[PDB]
Every structure is written in structure tokens, then in C-alpha cells.
């Protein structure tokens, strides 16, 4: 186009920027809520796998 | 549209650029490439085509359409 | 040093494997050396250069054995080994060579090796394992897959990403195109059992790629294929190219899907699919709830279609107990003399279905009264609006005709709602097309009465032309929308051409891609459209009740392409500078003069271009399966022939005099358009002399060329 | 939740027939249904303190995974054929189209479109919009542990179509 | 690309249009009309009944102006106008000036 | 509201020091007291807040091992069902 | 909206998490996620937590 | 089950062939496809191994693992569902059992 | 009844069959021949089909 | 119960960072035992739970 600016020289193209999620990073606590989910997730695909996959 | 401010916390998408995107495109491409591979020979086992140019279904053979014997 | 110890071993190994092989065949040093006679000096002999085959078979005899254990320990089987004491395994199982039987190291070598090679994959392979399952499949996964890591991809990422993989399934389905519709080829893939329905009954994610199936997913994809390439330069500067992109994609497989169902299930799936992925991409400006409206008016009316789809195979299903589209087509006919008990009527059961999946085609294909969606669908962006109205979801109630073909031919509520719905439809829409400023709305009311036509073609009782009017009102409807999206980019988002005009000098290339697009999807005389329009009128039934009207809608729908046409062409490029200044002005600076300078993108040239290019190789194509005196194309699946073609091979004088009057009305129609005077001008005196030396120059012509010479 | 709970009571009152399978089937799937719709009304609660339309819209652009789980959410609950919504009405509805077919086109019309069309039209305007007013206490995404609860309704009402067809 | 910290909005001059640029366009377009005789008299502090410019006067050079300055002007805005640097403070500082 | 305790002991928190500095001469007459902690937290480099930084295996490795165990399992389940040990490889397999 | 960032990777996050007022304690921050699901306090394993303190003194005053 | 087609006669069949015609019959799967045979599972490992190192290429460089460790997950998942289709007795179109 | 069901549901994959292994130049005449009236004997009263109740006396549950 | 318990006991030590790096200061045993306890455990009832409903034991095989 006429007067582009590429995206080096650009001082709004952001590169991937965000936070994933709500969770801390630097959170301290002992939170085991995604843990659990994790363990429920998982427990839930190995017992399709390994009880009813065939 | 003239560019804004986007905040840093915020995980949009708007006018994100990944300065590593070439190995991305290797890595989320071949990957797919193989899953699809799979799916594709699991699915071509249950595959149904016509006879070719030249054959026809003999009425006696075990492949034609059969009925029930009741 | 490794290496050469390696190698030593390699060769070693090799030398003993060939030894052993060559003397254990004939069966009479099977054993005898092998397992010599003690004699330690014998011992060390078979101890030593054996070496390595007894080494790799200790390994062999390790290997298996704790291999035997995990099984033991996973399976609870066997009860292990409790007959041995891994003294008498290992020793028993390492003195015998039985193992290395017809067994070599460089041949299982160079059989690893060739199992890879891709020089011999063979063209009869391709014909009968279709391919271009893998390639949709890495199209939708690679667009899924985009939409959850659009952090990992930016905006090059998921453009080449995606382009990659649509490219992919592009060249796949091109080589199946031509098979398909030439080669009598088509194909029934079963993705494995998909989920149970009915007590016992489970139906399978079944995919039918055959004629009907092939020629609405090529469209599609290539459509689909030139508007991707296009919608990177029409969204250049946008927060959200990532996201419009992937929308695209998702509605392309969604529709995909949709024309390539096997089952009902597999039906109803990607109608849903398509409802909302035209939602969303509709509602693509989510901060808007002026395009939230809208959206919801086409979410409303596609919940609509989705409750008479599903209620109609709910009607197949209590009827035939089956969802296996051929099935149902070729059984449908044993219950044609069937009824239904509803409520206090008794309607028969193929007058019923047919009025379910009519409704449901008639509000997708958008017709007269469930109409009002698309027009206000037109917030969406430009290659959303040219993916949806060129084909996929306009044509979705063409693909349900077309499918259920047997159904329809039985049906006496098709063959009276077919004809005056479709002439009605094609009426309004071409009426209201010429009439409008909005380049979107003109395309879209152009959109609503072509597919007033299909619905007209169909009840013709000829599937071809169904299929032909398909194809070139869908490439060039898609193009002419490109076009127009360029146009509307340059305005700054104004789409009515009563601020436009002059745009020739700055969109050169779009005032001649648009001249070729539009000449061609109104179906000017000398075009693809003319030869889609004339095989609609060579086959429409007259043994209707209501034949006036149909006929004369369809008349007026026919004539009113010149009209749109006309007005979009000349009011965008070559009216009077209704623009503002700051459209002009700013273009036109001379510091821009460069070999650079361009109003479009180089890449939506080349795009616009190659799909024009690759349309008219593709109505050429389908022309000369069609309408070739040698008749080429594959089977349709239909039994109901009529005598349709006949006019078209051999027509009789009052149907070429039938032609000739709606030719030439098109001509008065072109006449009025090019030098009726609506403004005073100073060439209004020369205009009407140039109209009577044209008159006298034809009148002259036609003499000399007929008679004189 | 009514509506859904009046359908699946429907099932039932044909005895012991081939008809209580749809029942247990839409039980299970409205449970999953209902938690994931309560849940992300408490997701919406404890983000922008309100529940009612007039005061929060344009989640999708400050909460963007909210906003995805919302329309995911009307996906699922519009009965889309690859999870089991779509089975308990295609078992429940056959079914009655065999009993009544009137009936049942009524029960379909006034279910599967005008109250799916109010619902769409209640959750649509919450998802889109701009979220102008009270810039200072707009919230966060949505954290792993509601994401992982809605994944996992998610997960449950697509696989739960692959279980054993012996007991459906 | 963004420098990865926070960085807020940046208010700049506060013109979205070139200030000097939009007085001179203006007053080369009011100087057009048949019945502002002295241009040379047009000042950014001046009135509109000063450079002898009537209600209507002013609401075809106002119609004019939008239409040259790619923008829609309110008539409540237009009546807010009381000289010509306030016209053009408003046409420089609206987003949409081109 | 939260009643955990920030000073954990499983590991030292990643702490920036020299971002802050306090104050600690030139004050006036009228300024405010310096403020004692001024750490401020110091992420890992290589550290995406938009992505999950798991860059561990074991999540895979436990999912391929009972994909492996349902696979073997499969084996022996069909080899019992059909009256053998193990599966009798047809020399032809067709298509279904 | 562009200034907020409560985990401090863009803009740097005290581990204080906040500067007290001259007129308000120096209560902690409310977090992102209020979430309750906390273990108890988790010390490494083979802890020494002894009351040195006490046994010296005691030590001294035997 | 009955034949449930209009039965040809041997002399018909022969004449059929004397034309150039060939009597369509299934044909069996090739090794690729295969899923019990040894070019299917040297296949199989090469794509674990491939999808290994390419896992351990992008941790290397930031691009995403997932999709690798998908394949990796799924080629065992492949050979259970293409087995288990083979192994059962239903058929739809393809060679009767 | 989920055998009669299955009797269906084997005749209408047979069909499915002869629509891929024979032309539609032919078709109809060899499912005339035996297919259609196995088709109408296995209709909606001989089977349940999606129904919810197979309606049948004592004598036909029997039997 | 023991994997489900040494699952979250080892996962839930705090945010991304911290679990990170209380993962990094950990000998080698100590790792291998926060990623192969949680997952031998539920395993191996997984394989019980397979191995009760399976009837490999069967002696009518050939
Ligand atoms: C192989 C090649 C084939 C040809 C391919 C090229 C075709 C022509 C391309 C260039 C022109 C395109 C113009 C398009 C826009 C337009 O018409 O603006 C009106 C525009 C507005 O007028 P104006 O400039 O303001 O001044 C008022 C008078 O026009 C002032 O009048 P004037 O003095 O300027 O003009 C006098 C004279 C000056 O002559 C020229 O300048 C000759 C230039 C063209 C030569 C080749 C064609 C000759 C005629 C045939 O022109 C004529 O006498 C032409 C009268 C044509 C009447 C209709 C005759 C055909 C009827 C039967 C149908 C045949 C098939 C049609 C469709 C074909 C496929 C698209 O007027 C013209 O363009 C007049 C010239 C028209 C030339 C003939 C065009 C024939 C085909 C129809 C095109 C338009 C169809 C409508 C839909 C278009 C959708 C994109
Ligand atoms: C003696 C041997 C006996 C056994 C023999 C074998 C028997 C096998 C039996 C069957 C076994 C089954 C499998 C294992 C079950 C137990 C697993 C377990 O406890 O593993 C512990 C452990 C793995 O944990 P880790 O690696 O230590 O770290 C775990 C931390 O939580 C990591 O913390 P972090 O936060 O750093 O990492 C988080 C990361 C790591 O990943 C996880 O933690 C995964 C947790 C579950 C996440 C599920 C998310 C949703 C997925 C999709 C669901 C469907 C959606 C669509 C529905 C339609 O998450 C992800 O990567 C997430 C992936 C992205 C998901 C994005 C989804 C977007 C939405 C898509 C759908 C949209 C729809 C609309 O296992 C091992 O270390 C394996 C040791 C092997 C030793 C073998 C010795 C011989
Ligand atoms: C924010 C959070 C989410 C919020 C959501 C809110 C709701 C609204 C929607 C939002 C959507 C956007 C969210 C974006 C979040 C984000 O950051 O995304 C980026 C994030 C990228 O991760 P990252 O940032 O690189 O960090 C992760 C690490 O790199 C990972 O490192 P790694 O290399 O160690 O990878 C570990 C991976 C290794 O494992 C895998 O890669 C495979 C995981 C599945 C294993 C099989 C489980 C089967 C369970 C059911 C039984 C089925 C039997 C039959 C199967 C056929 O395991 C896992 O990630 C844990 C999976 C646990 C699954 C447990 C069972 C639950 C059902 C799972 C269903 C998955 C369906 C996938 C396809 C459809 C997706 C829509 O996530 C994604 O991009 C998601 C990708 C999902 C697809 C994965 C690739 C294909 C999987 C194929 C499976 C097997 C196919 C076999 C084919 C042949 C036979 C048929
Ligand atoms: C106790 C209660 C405890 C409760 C705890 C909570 C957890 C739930 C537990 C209950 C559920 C248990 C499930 C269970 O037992 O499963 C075992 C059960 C055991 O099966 P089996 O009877 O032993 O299998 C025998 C043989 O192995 C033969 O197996 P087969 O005959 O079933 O074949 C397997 C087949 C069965 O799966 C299918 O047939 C999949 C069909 C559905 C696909 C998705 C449809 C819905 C999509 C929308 C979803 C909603 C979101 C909408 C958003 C908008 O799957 C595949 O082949 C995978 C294909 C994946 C790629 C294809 C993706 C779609 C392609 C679309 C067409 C192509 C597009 C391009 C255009 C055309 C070309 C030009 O596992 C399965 O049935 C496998 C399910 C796999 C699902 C797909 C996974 C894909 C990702 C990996
Ligand atoms: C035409 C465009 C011009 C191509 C020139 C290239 C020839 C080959 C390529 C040179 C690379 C440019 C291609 C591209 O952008 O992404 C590819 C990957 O992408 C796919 O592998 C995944 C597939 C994407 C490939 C896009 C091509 C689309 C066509 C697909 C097949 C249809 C072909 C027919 C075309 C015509 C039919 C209509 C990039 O690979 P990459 O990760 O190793 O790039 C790395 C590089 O290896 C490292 O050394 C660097 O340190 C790192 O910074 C990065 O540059
Ligand atoms: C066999 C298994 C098949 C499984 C199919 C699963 C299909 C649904 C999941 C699709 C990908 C995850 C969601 C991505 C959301 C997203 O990126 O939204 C963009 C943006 C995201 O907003 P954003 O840009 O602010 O955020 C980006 C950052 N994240 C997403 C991490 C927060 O959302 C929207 O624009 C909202 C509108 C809806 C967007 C999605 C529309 C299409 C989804 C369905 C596609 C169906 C295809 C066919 C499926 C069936 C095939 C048989
Ligand atoms: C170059 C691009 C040309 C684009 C415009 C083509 C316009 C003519 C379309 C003709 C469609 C009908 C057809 O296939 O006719 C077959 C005929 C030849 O077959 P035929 O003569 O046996 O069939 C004609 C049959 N009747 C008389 C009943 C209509 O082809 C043509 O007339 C030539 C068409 C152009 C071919 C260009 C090839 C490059």
C-alpha cells in the first residue's frame, strides 16, 4: 500500500502477548483445584482406555 | 483501521504476530498431516467402490446383495 | 572406532546368517553342526563364528523373556515360567539357531528401506483408495487446530497453514473431480460406527463422494480456495484476519461435510454446521449488535430449517427404519402408496417428506417469503458474502434436491411448489436487483433469483442443468462479489455506487474483471449464463396450472440481468465523480506514481483472475460432458428421464421462434439501457444520432449479409 | 432446565417400553446440560457481578474463554448431531411421531425453535457487544479450573455417544 | 513490534488532522462563497456575521466543508460553532477528518 | 479471605531487587517515609503467560503406555474371545 | 484496561503486591482467583523445625 | 441369506467373458493399509520415531508438542480401532465375511 | 424384536449394496425381484423399528 | 486413593513458576517418584479392573 510500516518498525503489532488463564504464576498457594480436574480428566480417559476401547 | 493499544493481560488476537511462526506452521502442519494419515487408512479399510470400467457383479458370487432366508 | 567395530559386527553377522540359511534349507545340516557333538575344539567352532548370531540371539532370548513378564504382569496370563528356571530358557533358546531361518541383515534392511518409497505409488491406488479423504480431513483438522493455537501462529502462520492445507485438498479433489464426473467413479467411505439412534440400532459417520457430491464440494472448495487467497488482501489492516480467515474455513468443511453425507445424520450434522458457522461468520463484528440482529435473523430462520430436516428424517427413519442415504433413495419408491395419520388428515407419506425437506430447502436457498435473511446477511465481510451467496449455503436446498432426487419425482407438491416458487423467487430477485444502489444487496437479490432459477431447473426434470447453472452462477457470482469487495474497500466501506464513479482509472483491473463477470453471470447473449438460461427455458414444463405466471416471472426474472449488470458496471466505474474528494484526491498524489502503485493487491488481482480462469475451464468442461452430442457424464441416479433433450438436439421451428422473441427483447432491453437519456448532457444530440446511423447500420447489415453476400 | 425435564418425563409414560432408554439418556444429558449452564452463570456472576442481560454484554472481548464456553454452550444445547442431546430427542421423538405425529411436531416447532430462539437471543446479546461501562473493574478470563469443568462437560456430552448401545 | 510492556494510550498533539491544514482548507473554502467579499479579511478569531456570512451562508459552507473534509457535521455542533477557529478545532480534532 | 502463608518454604520466591530502590537519603521536610520491601517478581526468561509451559513427557508417556496397554489388551481379549492363545492372521484381509 | 496486570510479567508486580496508605494497614491484595481449595501449608520433606531458639535459651538458663 | 438377484446361467457367464467382460470380486488390502502387516507397523514406528524428535525439536524452539504427542498417542488408538473394525463380523458393502 | 430389527437393518444394507455394486440402468428390476418384498414384509407393523412400543397380542409375542 | 493423593500432594504446590521450580530443585529420584507414583498406581488398577472383567483363564483354547 502506500505508506506501510512493517511489523518491526510498528509500535502497535503486538507479538503474542496475554495471560492463559486467571491462575498466578507466581501464585503461592497450595491450590490443588486444577490438580484434581487434571487427575479427573485423566482417570476418566485411562479407564475408557483401558476398560472399554475394545 | 488505524492501530490501537492492546492490553498486555488480555489474550486477543488482534493484530498478533509471532515473530517464530515458521517453525509453528512446521510443527502444527506435519503433525496433522500424520494424524490424518492414520484416520485416513482407518477409514479406507471401511471403503465401497463400484466395479471398474469392464466388470460386472456376478448375481451368484458372495458380493452380490443378498436376502434374508427366513 | 565404533563405527568400524560396528561395521565388522554387521558384516560378521551377515557372513554367518548366509552360512547358516544356505545350510539349514535342504534339511540335512539343519541340526547336525549346529548343535555338534561336544568336543570343545567343535564347541568353540560353533561358539566363535557363530558368535554373533548366538549373541543377538541371547539378546532374543532376554528380550522376549522379560517382554513375557510385562504381558504377565499387565495380563495376568501364562503364569509365567514357572516350568523354567532361566537356566534351561536362556541356554535352550540361545543354542537354537531355528530362529535365524531364511533370515538375512541386509535384506531386512533394504526391505525397511523400500517400505517408504513413494515412486511406486501406483495411479490405480489413488482410483481406488480415494486420497482426498486425507487432504479434507488435513484441511479441517489444520483449521481446528489454528482456531486453538492462533497464539502459536500469527497472522503469516495461520495464513500459510491454512493455505497449505487447502491447496492440498484443492489438488486432491480436482484429480477425483474429473473421475467423478467423467469416469462413472464415486465412493462410500465409513468413518467407523458413529453412535447408536435406536434400541439396536447404531448409524456410522458415512461419507458419499459421488456426482452430486463432487460437484458441489469442487465448487465449494474452489470458491472457497479463491476467496482465502482474496480474503488475506481484503482484511490487509484488520485486527482479525486470523479470525476471519479460520471462519471461512470452518463454514468451507462445514459445507464440505454437508455435500458429502452419506447418511441423514451425517446430513442433519452438517446443516447444523453450516447454520452456525454462517452465524458466526455473519456476526464477524461482534462489538456490533446491528450485526447481532442480523445474524440472529439468519440463526432464527436456519433453526427453522434445521426443525423441518429433522422432522422429515424422522418421518424416513419410522417409515424405513434406515438413515443410509442410497438406501433411501432406492427404496423410497415401495411407499410412494403409503399415508400418514396426522391429527384428522391422512396425508401421503411422500407428499409429507417432500413438503418437510422442500421447506427446509426453500428457507436455505433463499426463496420468496424466507427470503428476508439473506439481504440483511450482507453485514458479514465481502468473502463471507461471496462464500455464502455464490454457493454453500444458498445452494444447500439445491444439494437437498438434487440427493433425494426419487423422492421428488413422486411428489405431487414439488411439482406444483418447484416451478411457482422458483419463478416467483427468480422475479423478485432479479426485479429487486436491478433496482438496487448497494453493490452487496444488488448481488444478493441477484443470488435469490438464480436460485429461484435452480429451483425452476430442477422442476424441469433435468439434473444437468441444474448442475451447469449451479457451477457458472456460483464462479461467477463469487468473482463479481470479489470484485465488488475491492470496489467497496477502495469507497471506505461505502458499498451504494451513488458515491462512487471514475473508479475505472483506479481499479483498472476490477472494472475489467467485473465487465467479464458480470456479462457472464447475467447471462448476457454469447455467454456461459446465456447457454445456463436457454437450457432452463429449452426444458420448463407447460402442462402447469399456474404456467402464465411461472413463464412470464421467469421471463421478466431473465431480462432483468442486463438491468443489475448494467447499473453496477457503468455507476461504479464509468458515471459521473459521485465520490467525495478525499476518495480521489488521495490516490492520486504524484508522489505515488510508482511502479508499485495499486489501489487492490497484486494478490487479489492474481486470485480474481485465476478464478475466473479456472470457471471457465470448468463450465467448458462440464459443457462438453453435458451438452455434447456425445453424452459423457456419469450416472445421476435418476429414472425419470424426459424428453427435455430433444429440444435441445433437435428443437422444432416455434421453440427457436419462442427463443428468438425472448433474444430479442433482451435486445430492445439492451438498446433502452445504452442510450436512453435520464440527464441533459452535451452529447444528447449526437447520442440520438448515433442511435439512428446504428439503426440504419444494422437494418443495412442484415441486408448485405443475408442476401447481397 | 423445565423444558428439558417435561421432555424426558414425556418418555416415561408409555410403561415399561422401548421408550425409557431416551429417558435415562436425556437424564444424563440434561444433568450435564443444566451443571454447564449453571456454571457459567456463576462464571458470569463472580466475574461482572450481574446476572441479567441489561447489565453485562460483550463478554467475548474482555472474557474471551467465557464468551467461547457461552457459544459452545448454545451449540451443544441446540442439539447438534455428534453429542447426546441429539440422541435422547431423536430416540424420544420418533417415538412420539410414531404415537402422534401432530403432537410431535408441535413438541419440536415450540421446543427446538421458539424456545431455542429465545434462549440463543438471551445468551447471544450477553456474548456480543461491548463491554464499555466499568472499564477500572473489568474481570479476568476464565481460570483452569472452570475451564477444565467445562471441558470436561464438554468431553462427557461428546464421548457419552460411543458407550455401549446394549443398555441404549 | 509492542516493547512487551505496558504501554498507555498516547494522546499526542490531540489533532487527528493537521490544525494548520484544516484552517486553510476551511477558509479557501468560505473564501468560494459569492458573498464573503474580502478572503483576506478571514481570520480564525473572526466571526461569521464579521466575514459577512449569514445563517444559510453558513449552512451551505458547512454542508460544503463536510462534504470536502470527508465528515458529517451535527447541527447541534454546527449551531455550537461561533468562529472559525472553533470550526476548525472540531473538524482537527474528530477521527474522522480526511 | 486468603489466609495462606506467602513464605513458603518448598523454595525461595524468584525475586527482583534492584527494580525498586528505596530511598534512603535527601528526604524534606514535608516528603513520606520510604517503603522497606521493594522486590518485585522476577519470571523465568524463557517464561509465555499465553501457553501452558508444561515441558515435561510424562503426561504423554502416560497416555502412549495405557493406549500400548489397551492395544495388547485388545490382542489378548480378541485371542480368548475367538478360543486360541493369540490371533490367527488371516493371509488376506478385505475390505468391510 | 492497558495498565492492568495483576501477575506482574508486563509490569513488574511487588512482592509486597501493593503500597499502604499512610492511613490504611497493609492488608494483602485480593487475588485473581479467590479460589479456597488450599492445602495446608506444605514444608519439604525431612524438615527441621526444632525450636532452636527455645533450647537455647533453655540451655543457657541450665 | 438367499442370492436375491435374477440368476445367470454358466453358458451366459462364459459368453460374458468371451466379450472381455471380468467378473468383479473384492480385493484385499495392501500392506499400507493393511493393519496387520509388517509394512503398517514399520510404518508405525517410524512416525513414533519422527514424532519424537520433532518433539523434542520444537521444546527446542518453542513450537508446539501436542500435536506430535497426538500422533504418538494415536498410533496405538489407529491399530485398535482399525483391528476392531476388521474383526468384527459386520459388513456393509465390502467382502462378504 | 431387536432381531427383526437387525433382519430390517441387514436388508437395508443390502440395499445400500446393490446401489454401489449395481448401475441404476438395472437396478430397480433386480430389487424387484426379491428385495422389495422382503423390504415391505419387514415394514412397520412386522417390526418395531423406531417405535416405542411393538404392539403385538399375546399370540404374536409368542409366535 | 495413593494416586489420586500423591497426584495433587506434588502437582498443587503452588503456581507455574513455583512448581517449576520446586520440580528443578529436586534430585533425580525425587522426580521419577513425583511422575511414576501417581501414575503406577491408577495403572495398575486400571489393569486389575481390565483383568476382572476379562476371561482369559478360560481352558477351553487352542
Ligand atoms: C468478440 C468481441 C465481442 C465484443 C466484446 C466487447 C463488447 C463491448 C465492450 C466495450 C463497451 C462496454 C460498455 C458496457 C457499459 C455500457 O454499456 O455503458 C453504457 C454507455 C453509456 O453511454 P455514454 O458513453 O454515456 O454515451 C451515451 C451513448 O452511449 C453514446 O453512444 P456512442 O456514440 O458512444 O455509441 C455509438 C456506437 C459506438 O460504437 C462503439 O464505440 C463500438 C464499441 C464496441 C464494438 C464492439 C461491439 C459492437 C456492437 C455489437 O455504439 C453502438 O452503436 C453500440 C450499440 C449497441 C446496442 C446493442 C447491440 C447488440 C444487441 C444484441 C446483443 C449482442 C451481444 C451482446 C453481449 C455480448 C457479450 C457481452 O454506452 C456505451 O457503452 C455505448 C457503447 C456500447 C458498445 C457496444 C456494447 C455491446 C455489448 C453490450 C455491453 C453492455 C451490456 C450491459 C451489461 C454490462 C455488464 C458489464
Ligand atoms: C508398573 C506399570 C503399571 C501401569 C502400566 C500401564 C497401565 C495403563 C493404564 C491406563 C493409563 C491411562 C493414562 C494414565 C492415567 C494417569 C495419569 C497420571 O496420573 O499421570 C501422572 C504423571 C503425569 O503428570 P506430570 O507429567 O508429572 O505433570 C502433571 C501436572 O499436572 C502438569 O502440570 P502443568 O500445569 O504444568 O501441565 C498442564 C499440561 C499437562 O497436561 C495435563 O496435565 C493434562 C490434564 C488433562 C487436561 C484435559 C484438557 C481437555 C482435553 C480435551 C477434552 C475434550 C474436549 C473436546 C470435547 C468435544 O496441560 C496441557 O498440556 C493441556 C493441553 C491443552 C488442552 C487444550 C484444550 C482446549 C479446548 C479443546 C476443546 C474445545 C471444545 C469446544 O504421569 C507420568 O509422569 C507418567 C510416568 C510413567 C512411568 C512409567 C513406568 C513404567
Ligand atoms: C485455556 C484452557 C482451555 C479453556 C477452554 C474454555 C472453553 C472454550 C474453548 C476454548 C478453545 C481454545 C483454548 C486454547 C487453549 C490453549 O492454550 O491451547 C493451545 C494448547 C497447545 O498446548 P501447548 O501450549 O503446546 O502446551 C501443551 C504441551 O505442549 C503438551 O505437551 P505434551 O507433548 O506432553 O502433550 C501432552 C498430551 C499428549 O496427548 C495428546 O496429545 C493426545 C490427547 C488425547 C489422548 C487420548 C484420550 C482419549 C480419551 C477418550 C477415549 C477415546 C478413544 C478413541 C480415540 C480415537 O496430553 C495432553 O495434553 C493431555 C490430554 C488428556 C486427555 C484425557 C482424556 C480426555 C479427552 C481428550 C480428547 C482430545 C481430543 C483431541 C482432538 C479434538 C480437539 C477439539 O492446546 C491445544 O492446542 C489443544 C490441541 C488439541 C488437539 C491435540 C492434537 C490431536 C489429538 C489427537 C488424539 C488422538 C487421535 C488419534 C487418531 C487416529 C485414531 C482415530
Ligand atoms: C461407566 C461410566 C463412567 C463415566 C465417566 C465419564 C466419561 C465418559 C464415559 C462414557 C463414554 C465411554 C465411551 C466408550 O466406551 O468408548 C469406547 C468405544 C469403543 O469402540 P468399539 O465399539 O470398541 O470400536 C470397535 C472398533 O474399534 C471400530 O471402532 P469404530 O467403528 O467406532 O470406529 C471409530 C470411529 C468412530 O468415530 C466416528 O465415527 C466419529 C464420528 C463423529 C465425528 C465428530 C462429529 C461431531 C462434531 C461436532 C461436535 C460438537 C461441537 C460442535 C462445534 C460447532 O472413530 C474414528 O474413526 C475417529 C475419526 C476421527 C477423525 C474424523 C473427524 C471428523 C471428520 C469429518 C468428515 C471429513 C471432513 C472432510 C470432508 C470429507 C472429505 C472430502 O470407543 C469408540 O467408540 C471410539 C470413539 C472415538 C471418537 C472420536 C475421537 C476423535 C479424536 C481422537
Ligand atoms: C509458494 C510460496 C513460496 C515457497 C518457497 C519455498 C520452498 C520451500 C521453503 C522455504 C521456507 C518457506 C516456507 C514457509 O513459509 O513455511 C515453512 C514451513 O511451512 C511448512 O512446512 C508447512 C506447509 C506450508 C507451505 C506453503 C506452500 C503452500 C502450497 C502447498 C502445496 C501446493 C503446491 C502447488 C502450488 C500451486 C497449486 C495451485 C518454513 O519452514 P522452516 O520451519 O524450516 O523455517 C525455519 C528455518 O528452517 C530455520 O533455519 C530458521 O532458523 C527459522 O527462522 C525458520 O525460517
Ligand atoms: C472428531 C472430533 C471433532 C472435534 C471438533 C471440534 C470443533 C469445535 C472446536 C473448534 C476449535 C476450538 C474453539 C476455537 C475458538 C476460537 O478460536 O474462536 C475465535 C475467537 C476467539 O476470540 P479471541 O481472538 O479474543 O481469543 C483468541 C485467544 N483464545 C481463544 C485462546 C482466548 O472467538 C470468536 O471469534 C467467537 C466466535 C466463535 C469462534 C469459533 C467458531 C467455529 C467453531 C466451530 C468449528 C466447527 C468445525 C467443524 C466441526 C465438526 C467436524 C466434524
Ligand atoms: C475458449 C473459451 C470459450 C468460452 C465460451 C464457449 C461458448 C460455447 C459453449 C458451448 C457449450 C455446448 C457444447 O459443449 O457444445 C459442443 C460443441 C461441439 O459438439 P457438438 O457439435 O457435437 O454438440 C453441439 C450440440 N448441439 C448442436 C445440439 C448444441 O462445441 C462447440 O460448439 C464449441 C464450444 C467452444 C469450445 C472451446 C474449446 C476451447
Redesign the pocket.
Known sequence: DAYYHDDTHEGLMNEPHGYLTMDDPMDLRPNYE??A???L???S???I??LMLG | FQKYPIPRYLHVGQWIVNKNWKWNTFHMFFPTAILCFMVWRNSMISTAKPPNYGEYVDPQSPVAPKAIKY | LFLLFFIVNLYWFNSGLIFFNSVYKIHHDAWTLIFQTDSILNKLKIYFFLLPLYISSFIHSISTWYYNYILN??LFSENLNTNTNFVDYITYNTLLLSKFEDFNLFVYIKTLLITFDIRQINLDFLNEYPIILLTGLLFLFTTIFSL?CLSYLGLYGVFILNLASILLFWLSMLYYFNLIVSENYYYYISLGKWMYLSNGFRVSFDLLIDLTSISFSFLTLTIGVFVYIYTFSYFRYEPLVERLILFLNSFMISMILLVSSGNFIVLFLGWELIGLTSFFLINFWSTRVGTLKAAFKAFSFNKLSDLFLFFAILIIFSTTYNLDILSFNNQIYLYESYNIDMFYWSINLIEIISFFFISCAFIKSAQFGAHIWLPDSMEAPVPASALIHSATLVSAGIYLLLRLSPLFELSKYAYFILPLIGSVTAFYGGLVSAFQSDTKKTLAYSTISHCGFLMVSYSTGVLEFVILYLYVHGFFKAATFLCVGNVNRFNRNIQDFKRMGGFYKYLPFECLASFVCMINLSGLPLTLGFYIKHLLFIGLVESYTLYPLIFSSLILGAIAGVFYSYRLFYSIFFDTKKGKKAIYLQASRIILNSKFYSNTSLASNLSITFLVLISYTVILYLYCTTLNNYYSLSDLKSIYINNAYSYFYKPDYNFLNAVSILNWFVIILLISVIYLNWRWSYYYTKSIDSLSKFILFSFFFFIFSKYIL | TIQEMNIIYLAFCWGDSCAILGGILFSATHAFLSALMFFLVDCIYRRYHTRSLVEVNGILHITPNLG??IL?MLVFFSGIP?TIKFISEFYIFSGLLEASPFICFILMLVANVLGLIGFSKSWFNATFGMPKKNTKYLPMDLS?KE??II??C??F???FSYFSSIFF | YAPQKVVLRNEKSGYYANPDDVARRLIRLISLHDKVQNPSAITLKSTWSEIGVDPLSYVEIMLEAENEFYIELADEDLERFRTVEDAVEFIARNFFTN | RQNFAKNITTTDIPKDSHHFAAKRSGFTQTEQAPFAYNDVYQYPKDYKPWN???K????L???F??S???LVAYERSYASKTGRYQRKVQQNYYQI | LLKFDPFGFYSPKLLSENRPEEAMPFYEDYPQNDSHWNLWEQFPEDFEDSNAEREAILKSNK | MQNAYPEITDQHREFLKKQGLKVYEPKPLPDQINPFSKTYWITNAFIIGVSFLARRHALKVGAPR?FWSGCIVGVPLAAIISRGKSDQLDELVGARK | ELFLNEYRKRINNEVRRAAILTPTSSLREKMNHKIADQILDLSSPHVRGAHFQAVRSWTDASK | SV?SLS?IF??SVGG?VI??RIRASMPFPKRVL???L???A???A??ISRRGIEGHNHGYKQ
Request: charged share 10%.
Open positions: 486444577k490438580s480436574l487434571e487427575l480428566f485423566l482417570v480417559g485411562g479407564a482406555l483401558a | 504382569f499387565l486453538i | 467461547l464456553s459452545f455428534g483452569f475451564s477444565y471441558l470436561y464438554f468431553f456430552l461428546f464421548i | 501452558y509451559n508444561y515435561g513427557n510424562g503426561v508417556l502416560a497416555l503406555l495405557g500400548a496397554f489397551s | 501436542i | 494416586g497426584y506434588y502437582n507455574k512448581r517449576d513425583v511422575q511414576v501417581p501414575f503406577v491408577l495403572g495398575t486400571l489393569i
